[PDB]
Tab-separated table of C-alpha atoms in Angstrom:
chain	number	residue	atom	x	y	z
D	1460	UNK	CA	19.733	42.491	-49.255
D	1461	UNK	CA	20.164	44.986	-46.418
D	1462	UNK	CA	18.238	45.856	-43.281
D	1463	UNK	CA	19.310	48.961	-41.362
D	1464	UNK	CA	17.794	49.815	-37.974
D	1465	UNK	CA	18.737	52.830	-35.884
D	1466	UNK	CA	16.993	53.987	-32.725
D	1467	UNK	CA	17.350	56.575	-29.962
D	1468	UNK	CA	15.114	56.788	-26.895
D	1469	UNK	CA	15.434	58.121	-23.359
D	1470	UNK	CA	12.654	56.450	-21.356
D	1471	UNK	CA	10.825	53.303	-22.315
D	1472	UNK	CA	9.501	50.376	-20.314
D	1473	UNK	CA	8.787	47.467	-22.640
D	1474	UNK	CA	6.858	44.309	-21.746
D	1475	UNK	CA	6.903	41.647	-24.451
D	1476	UNK	CA	4.307	39.170	-23.230
D	1477	UNK	CA	2.552	39.834	-19.929
D	1478	UNK	CA	-0.133	37.591	-18.455
D	1479	UNK	CA	-2.163	37.992	-15.264
D	1480	UNK	CA	-4.642	35.613	-13.643
D	1481	UNK	CA	-6.395	36.551	-10.415
D	1482	UNK	CA	-8.656	33.512	-9.887
D	1483	UNK	CA	-2.332	27.211	-17.893
D	1484	UNK	CA	0.149	29.454	-19.727
D	1485	UNK	CA	1.995	28.477	-22.910
D	1486	UNK	CA	4.293	31.086	-24.479
D	1487	UNK	CA	5.472	31.138	-28.039
D	1488	UNK	CA	8.419	29.692	-29.890
D	1489	UNK	CA	10.091	32.889	-31.143
D	1490	UNK	CA	9.471	35.853	-28.829
D	1491	UNK	CA	11.686	38.924	-29.285
D	1492	UNK	CA	11.388	41.849	-26.872
D	1493	UNK	CA	13.246	45.062	-26.202
D	1494	UNK	CA	13.630	48.787	-26.648
D	1495	UNK	CA	15.106	47.943	-30.059
D	1496	UNK	CA	13.647	44.575	-31.092
D	1497	UNK	CA	14.619	43.173	-34.503
D	1498	UNK	CA	13.794	39.722	-35.891
D	1499	UNK	CA	14.713	38.452	-39.356
D	1500	UNK	CA	14.002	35.126	-41.086
D	1501	UNK	CA	12.446	33.392	-38.100
D	1502	UNK	CA	11.710	30.316	-40.249
D	1503	UNK	CA	13.487	29.381	-43.477
D	1504	UNK	CA	13.174	26.220	-45.515
D	1505	UNK	CA	10.644	23.618	-44.493
D	1506	UNK	CA	10.885	24.592	-40.822
D	1507	UNK	CA	8.221	24.865	-38.149
D	1508	UNK	CA	7.412	26.798	-34.979
D	1509	UNK	CA	4.397	25.156	-33.359
D	1510	UNK	CA	3.011	26.501	-30.076
D	1511	UNK	CA	0.072	24.283	-29.128
D	1512	UNK	CA	-1.893	23.707	-25.950
D	1513	UNK	CA	-4.375	20.924	-25.279
D	1514	UNK	CA	-7.035	20.712	-22.577
D	1515	UNK	CA	-8.590	17.261	-22.036
X	400	UNK	CA	22.898	39.919	-46.832
X	401	UNK	CA	23.540	42.441	-44.059
X	402	UNK	CA	21.726	43.314	-40.851
X	403	UNK	CA	22.968	46.459	-39.123
X	404	UNK	CA	21.434	47.466	-35.782
X	405	UNK	CA	22.378	50.475	-33.677
X	406	UNK	CA	20.691	51.723	-30.521
X	407	UNK	CA	21.127	54.361	-27.822
X	408	UNK	CA	18.991	54.634	-24.690
X	409	UNK	CA	19.349	56.034	-21.192
X	410	UNK	CA	16.543	54.485	-19.127
X	411	UNK	CA	14.665	51.360	-20.028
X	412	UNK	CA	13.406	48.477	-17.932
X	413	UNK	CA	12.566	45.551	-20.201
X	414	UNK	CA	10.590	42.410	-19.322
X	415	UNK	CA	10.518	39.731	-22.013
X	416	UNK	CA	7.968	37.227	-20.749
X	417	UNK	CA	6.188	37.892	-17.464
X	418	UNK	CA	3.525	35.665	-15.929
X	419	UNK	CA	1.525	36.217	-12.741
X	420	UNK	CA	-0.987	33.978	-10.986
X	421	UNK	CA	-2.645	35.031	-7.742
X	422	UNK	CA	-4.952	32.046	-7.131
X	423	UNK	CA	1.129	25.448	-14.903
X	424	UNK	CA	3.586	27.621	-16.866
X	425	UNK	CA	5.437	26.612	-20.046
X	426	UNK	CA	7.751	29.151	-21.713
X	427	UNK	CA	8.953	28.983	-25.261
X	428	UNK	CA	11.967	27.659	-27.084
X	429	UNK	CA	13.605	30.806	-28.487
X	430	UNK	CA	13.056	33.834	-26.238
X	431	UNK	CA	15.348	36.825	-26.826
X	432	UNK	CA	15.047	39.796	-24.476
X	433	UNK	CA	16.907	42.993	-23.741
X	434	UNK	CA	17.405	46.682	-24.381
X	435	UNK	CA	18.781	45.700	-27.802
X	436	UNK	CA	17.353	42.325	-28.864
X	437	UNK	CA	18.230	40.840	-32.268
X	438	UNK	CA	17.398	37.373	-33.615
X	439	UNK	CA	18.244	35.923	-37.039
X	440	UNK	CA	17.487	32.550	-38.659
X	441	UNK	CA	15.955	31.064	-35.529
X	442	UNK	CA	15.042	27.974	-37.585
X	443	UNK	CA	16.779	26.966	-40.817
X	444	UNK	CA	16.349	23.832	-42.872
X	445	UNK	CA	13.934	21.206	-41.657
X	446	UNK	CA	14.205	22.338	-38.032
X	447	UNK	CA	11.607	22.652	-35.294
X	448	UNK	CA	10.805	24.681	-32.187
X	449	UNK	CA	7.771	23.158	-30.497
X	450	UNK	CA	6.351	24.543	-27.255
X	451	UNK	CA	3.456	22.232	-26.402
X	452	UNK	CA	1.634	21.624	-23.150
X	453	UNK	CA	-1.084	19.099	-22.374
X	454	UNK	CA	-3.532	19.042	-19.468
X	455	UNK	CA	-5.129	15.656	-18.682
L	426	UNK	CA	26.592	37.660	-44.512
L	427	UNK	CA	27.266	40.248	-41.813
L	428	UNK	CA	25.410	40.934	-38.577
L	429	UNK	CA	26.432	44.121	-36.774
L	430	UNK	CA	24.966	45.223	-33.438
L	431	UNK	CA	26.045	48.251	-31.447
L	432	UNK	CA	24.313	49.471	-28.308
L	433	UNK	CA	24.919	52.166	-25.700
L	434	UNK	CA	22.780	52.548	-22.577
L	435	UNK	CA	23.064	54.044	-19.114
L	436	UNK	CA	20.317	52.571	-16.911
L	437	UNK	CA	18.395	49.439	-17.694
L	438	UNK	CA	17.224	46.442	-15.703
L	439	UNK	CA	16.265	43.491	-17.901
L	440	UNK	CA	14.243	40.416	-16.908
L	441	UNK	CA	14.008	37.711	-19.563
L	442	UNK	CA	11.453	35.251	-18.222
L	443	UNK	CA	9.788	35.987	-14.898
L	444	UNK	CA	7.084	33.840	-13.319
L	445	UNK	CA	5.178	34.539	-10.103
L	446	UNK	CA	2.706	32.314	-8.272
L	447	UNK	CA	1.024	33.444	-5.068
L	448	UNK	CA	-1.249	30.437	-4.468
L	449	UNK	CA	4.758	23.766	-12.158
L	450	UNK	CA	7.204	25.837	-14.230
L	451	UNK	CA	8.941	24.665	-17.409
L	452	UNK	CA	11.251	27.222	-19.049
L	453	UNK	CA	12.436	27.002	-22.589
L	454	UNK	CA	15.338	25.585	-24.521
L	455	UNK	CA	17.094	28.674	-25.915
L	456	UNK	CA	16.593	31.726	-23.689
L	457	UNK	CA	18.895	34.712	-24.266
L	458	UNK	CA	18.645	37.751	-21.992
L	459	UNK	CA	20.650	40.894	-21.383
L	460	UNK	CA	21.093	44.590	-22.032
L	461	UNK	CA	22.362	43.494	-25.463
L	462	UNK	CA	20.955	40.094	-26.459
L	463	UNK	CA	21.758	38.607	-29.882
L	464	UNK	CA	20.876	35.124	-31.148
L	465	UNK	CA	21.715	33.657	-34.558
L	466	UNK	CA	20.835	30.274	-36.083
L	467	UNK	CA	19.348	28.810	-32.920
L	468	UNK	CA	18.405	25.726	-34.973
L	469	UNK	CA	20.060	24.618	-38.218
L	470	UNK	CA	19.595	21.466	-40.241
L	471	UNK	CA	17.191	18.889	-38.903
L	472	UNK	CA	17.513	20.109	-35.314
L	473	UNK	CA	14.871	20.438	-32.620
L	474	UNK	CA	14.085	22.505	-29.534
L	475	UNK	CA	11.051	21.076	-27.764
L	476	UNK	CA	9.851	22.619	-24.502
L	477	UNK	CA	6.981	20.302	-23.592
L	478	UNK	CA	5.163	19.685	-20.341
L	479	UNK	CA	2.307	17.335	-19.502
L	480	UNK	CA	-0.034	17.346	-16.505
L	481	UNK	CA	-1.641	13.965	-15.742
H	38	UNK	CA	29.807	35.036	-42.209
H	39	UNK	CA	30.714	37.638	-39.590
H	40	UNK	CA	29.035	38.398	-36.265
H	41	UNK	CA	30.058	41.616	-34.518
H	42	UNK	CA	28.561	42.848	-31.235
H	43	UNK	CA	29.697	45.867	-29.251
H	44	UNK	CA	28.053	47.371	-26.177
H	45	UNK	CA	28.690	50.037	-23.547
H	46	UNK	CA	26.577	50.352	-20.396
H	47	UNK	CA	26.868	51.909	-16.957
H	48	UNK	CA	24.081	50.629	-14.688
H	49	UNK	CA	22.090	47.506	-15.360
H	50	UNK	CA	21.246	44.311	-13.501
H	51	UNK	CA	20.092	41.374	-15.623
H	52	UNK	CA	18.019	38.411	-14.426
H	53	UNK	CA	17.710	35.700	-17.070
H	54	UNK	CA	15.089	33.345	-15.668
H	55	UNK	CA	13.442	34.083	-12.328
H	56	UNK	CA	10.714	32.016	-10.678
H	57	UNK	CA	8.836	32.807	-7.462
H	58	UNK	CA	6.349	30.615	-5.594
H	59	UNK	CA	4.660	31.661	-2.366
H	60	UNK	CA	2.208	28.831	-1.577
H	61	UNK	CA	8.266	22.040	-9.306
H	62	UNK	CA	10.769	23.978	-11.445
H	63	UNK	CA	12.477	22.785	-14.638
H	64	UNK	CA	14.793	25.282	-16.354
H	65	UNK	CA	15.974	24.987	-19.894
H	66	UNK	CA	18.944	23.591	-21.744
H	67	UNK	CA	20.600	26.639	-23.342
H	68	UNK	CA	20.140	29.732	-21.154
H	69	UNK	CA	22.484	32.663	-21.829
H	70	UNK	CA	22.428	35.710	-19.556
H	71	UNK	CA	24.553	38.791	-18.969
H	72	UNK	CA	24.867	42.496	-19.628
H	73	UNK	CA	25.988	41.443	-23.126
H	74	UNK	CA	24.519	38.036	-24.030
H	75	UNK	CA	25.320	36.424	-27.398
H	76	UNK	CA	24.380	32.933	-28.611
H	77	UNK	CA	25.192	31.444	-32.018
H	78	UNK	CA	24.299	28.054	-33.514
H	79	UNK	CA	22.769	26.568	-30.386
H	80	UNK	CA	21.789	23.407	-32.300
H	81	UNK	CA	23.477	22.216	-35.496
H	82	UNK	CA	23.024	18.966	-37.368
H	83	UNK	CA	20.452	16.503	-36.120
H	84	UNK	CA	20.795	17.796	-32.556
H	85	UNK	CA	18.222	18.308	-29.822
H	86	UNK	CA	17.519	20.465	-26.777
H	87	UNK	CA	14.501	19.257	-24.822
H	88	UNK	CA	13.233	20.830	-21.604
H	89	UNK	CA	10.422	18.425	-20.737
H	90	UNK	CA	8.679	17.789	-17.441
H	91	UNK	CA	5.756	15.620	-16.385
H	92	UNK	CA	3.561	15.713	-13.274
H	93	UNK	CA	1.753	12.438	-12.498
U	885	UNK	CA	-6.410	64.762	12.864
U	886	UNK	CA	-5.731	61.712	10.696
U	887	UNK	CA	-4.405	61.137	7.200
U	888	UNK	CA	-4.632	57.611	5.792
U	889	UNK	CA	-3.005	56.710	2.469
U	890	UNK	CA	-3.073	53.264	0.897
U	891	UNK	CA	-1.861	52.372	-2.579
U	892	UNK	CA	-1.315	49.333	-4.799
U	893	UNK	CA	0.287	49.436	-8.245
U	894	UNK	CA	2.164	47.017	-10.481
U	895	UNK	CA	4.036	49.163	-13.014
U	896	UNK	CA	4.831	52.831	-12.702
U	897	UNK	CA	7.790	54.944	-13.748
U	898	UNK	CA	7.682	58.244	-11.879
U	899	UNK	CA	9.829	61.299	-12.622
U	900	UNK	CA	9.451	64.111	-10.102
U	901	UNK	CA	11.261	66.978	-11.801
U	902	UNK	CA	12.883	66.379	-15.181
U	903	UNK	CA	14.710	69.047	-17.172
U	904	UNK	CA	16.343	68.842	-20.601
U	905	UNK	CA	18.420	71.417	-22.466
U	906	UNK	CA	19.814	70.660	-25.909
U	907	UNK	CA	21.528	73.971	-26.765
U	908	UNK	CA	21.010	77.389	-15.278
U	909	UNK	CA	18.862	74.979	-13.245
U	910	UNK	CA	17.544	75.692	-9.745
U	911	UNK	CA	15.325	73.050	-8.121
U	912	UNK	CA	12.929	73.581	-5.287
U	913	UNK	CA	13.196	73.451	-1.529
U	914	UNK	CA	10.677	70.678	-0.799
U	915	UNK	CA	10.412	68.140	-3.628
U	916	UNK	CA	8.714	64.815	-2.859
U	917	UNK	CA	8.633	62.081	-5.502
U	918	UNK	CA	7.597	58.459	-5.671
U	919	UNK	CA	5.053	55.809	-6.514
U	920	UNK	CA	3.404	56.756	-3.209
U	921	UNK	CA	4.361	60.376	-2.485
U	922	UNK	CA	2.916	61.996	0.649
U	923	UNK	CA	3.807	65.416	2.074
U	924	UNK	CA	2.235	67.009	5.150
U	925	UNK	CA	2.834	70.391	6.812
U	926	UNK	CA	5.750	71.445	4.637
U	927	UNK	CA	5.864	74.827	6.414
U	928	UNK	CA	4.470	75.553	9.876
U	929	UNK	CA	4.820	78.698	11.933
U	930	UNK	CA	6.559	81.694	10.446
U	931	UNK	CA	8.778	79.527	8.238
U	932	UNK	CA	9.950	79.991	4.671
U	933	UNK	CA	10.916	77.979	1.595
U	934	UNK	CA	12.395	80.379	-0.946
U	935	UNK	CA	13.671	79.089	-4.294
U	936	UNK	CA	15.028	82.091	-6.192
U	937	UNK	CA	17.274	82.536	-9.197
U	938	UNK	CA	18.886	85.749	-10.395
U	939	UNK	CA	20.376	86.533	-13.798
U	940	UNK	CA	22.537	89.681	-13.979
Y	1497	UNK	CA	-2.237	63.698	14.856
Y	1498	UNK	CA	-1.563	60.530	12.866
Y	1499	UNK	CA	-0.149	59.864	9.414
Y	1500	UNK	CA	-0.511	56.272	8.232
Y	1501	UNK	CA	0.980	55.296	4.864
Y	1502	UNK	CA	0.924	51.846	3.294
Y	1503	UNK	CA	2.100	50.856	-0.168
Y	1504	UNK	CA	2.589	47.758	-2.317
Y	1505	UNK	CA	4.222	47.718	-5.749
Y	1506	UNK	CA	6.039	45.232	-7.951
Y	1507	UNK	CA	7.863	47.243	-10.627
Y	1508	UNK	CA	8.637	50.911	-10.391
Y	1509	UNK	CA	11.679	52.919	-11.397
Y	1510	UNK	CA	11.597	56.310	-9.693
Y	1511	UNK	CA	13.711	59.388	-10.472
Y	1512	UNK	CA	13.353	62.290	-8.048
Y	1513	UNK	CA	15.219	65.128	-9.731
Y	1514	UNK	CA	16.818	64.557	-13.125
Y	1515	UNK	CA	18.684	67.184	-15.134
Y	1516	UNK	CA	20.223	66.861	-18.596
Y	1517	UNK	CA	22.307	69.309	-20.618
Y	1518	UNK	CA	23.686	68.422	-24.038
Y	1519	UNK	CA	25.423	71.686	-25.009
Y	1520	UNK	CA	25.179	75.379	-13.691
Y	1521	UNK	CA	22.977	73.060	-11.595
Y	1522	UNK	CA	21.693	73.810	-8.082
Y	1523	UNK	CA	19.454	71.233	-6.372
Y	1524	UNK	CA	17.202	71.914	-3.453
Y	1525	UNK	CA	17.407	71.651	0.296
Y	1526	UNK	CA	14.817	68.974	1.126
Y	1527	UNK	CA	14.477	66.372	-1.637
Y	1528	UNK	CA	12.753	63.097	-0.712
Y	1529	UNK	CA	12.594	60.350	-3.333
Y	1530	UNK	CA	11.627	56.710	-3.539
Y	1531	UNK	CA	8.985	54.086	-4.174
Y	1532	UNK	CA	7.380	55.190	-0.891
Y	1533	UNK	CA	8.323	58.808	-0.132
Y	1534	UNK	CA	6.918	60.550	2.960
Y	1535	UNK	CA	7.845	63.963	4.383
Y	1536	UNK	CA	6.400	65.716	7.445
Y	1537	UNK	CA	7.095	69.125	9.019
Y	1538	UNK	CA	9.975	69.935	6.694
Y	1539	UNK	CA	10.125	73.403	8.291
Y	1540	UNK	CA	8.769	74.247	11.743
Y	1541	UNK	CA	9.072	77.443	13.725
Y	1542	UNK	CA	11.011	80.295	12.205
Y	1543	UNK	CA	13.078	78.008	9.971
Y	1544	UNK	CA	14.301	78.378	6.407
Y	1545	UNK	CA	15.134	76.304	3.343
Y	1546	UNK	CA	16.597	78.602	0.708
Y	1547	UNK	CA	17.801	77.315	-2.659
Y	1548	UNK	CA	19.156	80.400	-4.419
Y	1549	UNK	CA	21.522	80.762	-7.342
Y	1550	UNK	CA	23.003	83.897	-8.872
Y	1551	UNK	CA	24.598	84.375	-12.287
Y	1552	UNK	CA	26.903	87.397	-12.693
Q	1036	UNK	CA	1.834	62.100	17.145
Q	1037	UNK	CA	2.411	58.883	15.206
Q	1038	UNK	CA	3.922	58.331	11.770
Q	1039	UNK	CA	3.548	54.823	10.348
Q	1040	UNK	CA	4.994	53.753	6.992
Q	1041	UNK	CA	4.848	50.250	5.574
Q	1042	UNK	CA	6.057	49.340	2.102
Q	1043	UNK	CA	6.480	46.128	0.117
Q	1044	UNK	CA	8.041	46.025	-3.351
Q	1045	UNK	CA	9.761	43.515	-5.600
Q	1046	UNK	CA	11.637	45.467	-8.288
Q	1047	UNK	CA	12.525	49.117	-8.168
Q	1048	UNK	CA	15.585	51.170	-9.032
Q	1049	UNK	CA	15.523	54.618	-7.430
Q	1050	UNK	CA	17.670	57.631	-8.354
Q	1051	UNK	CA	17.294	60.631	-6.059
Q	1052	UNK	CA	19.191	63.420	-7.791
Q	1053	UNK	CA	20.807	62.711	-11.146
Q	1054	UNK	CA	22.650	65.286	-13.242
Q	1055	UNK	CA	24.150	64.793	-16.702
Q	1056	UNK	CA	26.290	67.183	-18.738
Q	1057	UNK	CA	27.559	66.257	-22.189
Q	1058	UNK	CA	29.318	69.519	-23.115
Q	1059	UNK	CA	29.169	73.277	-11.896
Q	1060	UNK	CA	26.949	71.102	-9.681
Q	1061	UNK	CA	25.723	72.014	-6.192
Q	1062	UNK	CA	23.495	69.413	-4.509
Q	1063	UNK	CA	21.266	70.116	-1.591
Q	1064	UNK	CA	21.426	70.038	2.169
Q	1065	UNK	CA	18.901	67.335	3.112
Q	1066	UNK	CA	18.550	64.708	0.377
Q	1067	UNK	CA	16.837	61.430	1.302
Q	1068	UNK	CA	16.597	58.633	-1.263
Q	1069	UNK	CA	15.605	54.988	-1.269
Q	1070	UNK	CA	12.945	52.392	-1.948
Q	1071	UNK	CA	11.364	53.633	1.299
Q	1072	UNK	CA	12.386	57.231	2.048
Q	1073	UNK	CA	10.950	59.022	5.099
Q	1074	UNK	CA	11.940	62.450	6.439
Q	1075	UNK	CA	10.511	64.231	9.485
Q	1076	UNK	CA	11.242	67.676	10.957
Q	1077	UNK	CA	14.153	68.419	8.647
Q	1078	UNK	CA	14.300	71.907	10.205
Q	1079	UNK	CA	12.968	72.839	13.648
Q	1080	UNK	CA	13.309	76.069	15.574
Q	1081	UNK	CA	15.335	78.844	14.019
Q	1082	UNK	CA	17.297	76.449	11.805
Q	1083	UNK	CA	18.465	76.874	8.227
Q	1084	UNK	CA	19.288	74.803	5.153
Q	1085	UNK	CA	20.733	77.006	2.424
Q	1086	UNK	CA	21.912	75.472	-0.849
Q	1087	UNK	CA	23.330	78.500	-2.648
Q	1088	UNK	CA	25.703	78.878	-5.562
Q	1089	UNK	CA	27.108	81.956	-7.275
Q	1090	UNK	CA	28.732	82.271	-10.699
Q	1091	UNK	CA	31.022	85.305	-11.084
V	57	UNK	CA	5.936	61.072	19.227
V	58	UNK	CA	6.511	57.742	17.483
V	59	UNK	CA	8.110	57.001	14.112
V	60	UNK	CA	7.691	53.492	12.707
V	61	UNK	CA	8.989	52.332	9.315
V	62	UNK	CA	8.804	48.806	7.946
V	63	UNK	CA	9.846	47.667	4.480
V	64	UNK	CA	10.314	44.443	2.527
V	65	UNK	CA	11.962	44.391	-0.903
V	66	UNK	CA	13.642	41.861	-3.166
V	67	UNK	CA	15.437	43.640	-6.023
V	68	UNK	CA	16.377	47.285	-5.980
V	69	UNK	CA	19.535	49.332	-6.444
V	70	UNK	CA	19.474	52.869	-5.046
V	71	UNK	CA	21.688	55.762	-6.159
V	72	UNK	CA	21.303	58.806	-3.920
V	73	UNK	CA	23.162	61.537	-5.787
V	74	UNK	CA	24.797	60.807	-9.134
V	75	UNK	CA	26.630	63.319	-11.321
V	76	UNK	CA	28.086	62.745	-14.791
V	77	UNK	CA	30.221	65.109	-16.873
V	78	UNK	CA	31.560	64.227	-20.309
V	79	UNK	CA	33.297	67.414	-21.523
V	80	UNK	CA	33.221	71.241	-10.207
V	81	UNK	CA	31.044	69.134	-7.879
V	82	UNK	CA	29.820	70.085	-4.396
V	83	UNK	CA	27.563	67.568	-2.628
V	84	UNK	CA	25.419	68.375	0.330
V	85	UNK	CA	25.581	68.177	4.087
V	86	UNK	CA	22.937	65.601	5.058
V	87	UNK	CA	22.556	62.946	2.347
V	88	UNK	CA	20.811	59.718	3.392
V	89	UNK	CA	20.612	56.799	0.966
V	90	UNK	CA	19.666	53.134	1.087
V	91	UNK	CA	16.959	50.616	0.310
V	92	UNK	CA	15.280	51.947	3.476
V	93	UNK	CA	16.350	55.552	4.146
V	94	UNK	CA	15.030	57.422	7.203
V	95	UNK	CA	16.046	60.874	8.466
V	96	UNK	CA	14.634	62.685	11.500
V	97	UNK	CA	15.402	66.137	12.923
V	98	UNK	CA	18.283	66.937	10.602
V	99	UNK	CA	18.554	70.448	12.091
V	100	UNK	CA	17.312	71.403	15.560
V	101	UNK	CA	17.801	74.626	17.466
V	102	UNK	CA	19.638	77.446	15.763
V	103	UNK	CA	21.587	75.023	13.565
V	104	UNK	CA	22.677	75.260	9.942
V	105	UNK	CA	23.442	73.076	6.933
V	106	UNK	CA	24.908	75.055	4.049
V	107	UNK	CA	26.011	73.543	0.742
V	108	UNK	CA	27.460	76.632	-0.932
V	109	UNK	CA	29.879	76.929	-3.822
V	110	UNK	CA	31.254	79.912	-5.710
V	111	UNK	CA	32.964	80.117	-9.102
V	112	UNK	CA	35.146	83.206	-9.657
């Protein structure tokens, strides 16, 4: 079909994924970040996005 | 189909994936970042985006 | 189909993937960063983008 | 299909992947960075982009 | 005497004086702006900081 | 006396004086801006900082 | 006396005085801008800093 | 007296005075700009810094 996106900002400070440790880090397979962030049909068909982590 | 995206900003400081350790880092397979970030059909058919990490 | 993107900014400082350690770094297979970042069909067919890392 | 991207900026400094260590670095296979960053069909067919690293 | 200032932040977007008109602008004589903004003894003695505006 | 100032940041986008008109601009005589902004004894004795503007 | 300033940053984009018109600009006599901006005794004695503007 | 300033940065772009017009510009007498900007005793004695402008 159709997807229409229209945006207008002036100030914006965007942080997609932020991680802090003070005393392992796996980040995902389809990460979309921004002032105008658009994602469409990340997986189609018999696809796969697997983000695993193992620990012993 | 159709995807139309239009954006207008003046100030914006974008950070897609940010990691901090003060006292292992694996980042993913399709990371799209910016003031205007668009992603389409990141996987199609029998594809794969696997972001694994093992630890002992 | 059709993918249209139009952006207009004035000030913006973008950081796609940023890692900091103060006391191992594997970065991913399709990383797109910028004031205007667009990605289409990062995988098609029986493709693969694997960002793995093991630790002992 | 058709892919159209148009952008207009004045001030912006982009940093695609940035790593800092203060007390091993593997960077990925398809990294696209700029004020206007566009990537299309990074993998097609039975292709592969692997950013793997081991440590002992 | 003594003035001690100590600060630690991670993210902060500071705007000292911001003005918007959509359909005259006089700004002051001692304007201090920042993440750590310190001002001491702006006027001493028989001084003066006059910020006037006249309109017909 | 003594003025001691100490600061530590990581991300901060500072804007001292910002003016916008969409449909006259006079800016002041002692404007100090930045991530660490310090001002001392901006006027001493019989001084003057005058930011005037007239309009017909 | 003593004035001590110590700063440590990583990312910061500073804009001291910024003016925008979309449909006369007088900027001031002592403007200090930067990641670390320090000003001391901008006027001493019988000094003067006058940022005036008239309009008909 | 004593003035001491110490700074350490990595990424930062400074713009002291910035003017934009899309449909007269007078800039001031003591403008100090940089990643580390320091100004001391801009006027001393019976001095003067005047940034004046008239319009008809």
